[PDB]
């Protein structure tokens, strides 16, 4: 295991889907809120007694 700071850990994953990593850093705040926001809904999806 080699430590990789999470900032550019996502960046390489973006390179793996044909997206330039420059967009991520310019949109780091938006992605973080979007990721956390999604975690909010997924929790309620299971808690909704479905």
């Amino acid at each position: 295991a080699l430590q990789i700071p999470f900032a550019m850990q996502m960046a390489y994953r973006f390179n793996g889907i044909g997206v330039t990593q420059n967009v991520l850093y310019e949109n780091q705040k938006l992605i973080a809120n979007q990721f956390n926001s999604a975690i909010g809904k997924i929790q309620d999806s299971l808690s909704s007694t479905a």
Binding site: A7, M8, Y12, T20, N22, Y25, E26, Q28
Partner: protein, 57 residues
């Protein structure tokens, strides 16, 4: 353009992810976009330009 930025204490370099092959930072292997006002973790440094030595040479 490829790999990540590394520094042996004070001298920054560019190397591929899966091996340590440090190289001098250059415009050819580092695509530039935007300005260093929104990226978190930017580091001030000069980027060697191969054209300048060739200019007037």
């Amino acid at each position: 353009r490829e790999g990540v930025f590394v520094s042996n204490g004070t001298h920054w370099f560019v190397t591929q992810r899966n091996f340590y092959e440090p190289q001098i930072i250059t415009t050819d292997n580092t695509f530039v976009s935007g300005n260093c006002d929104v990226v978190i973790g930017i580091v001030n440094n000069t980027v060697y330009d191969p054209l300048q030595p060739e200019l007037d040479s």
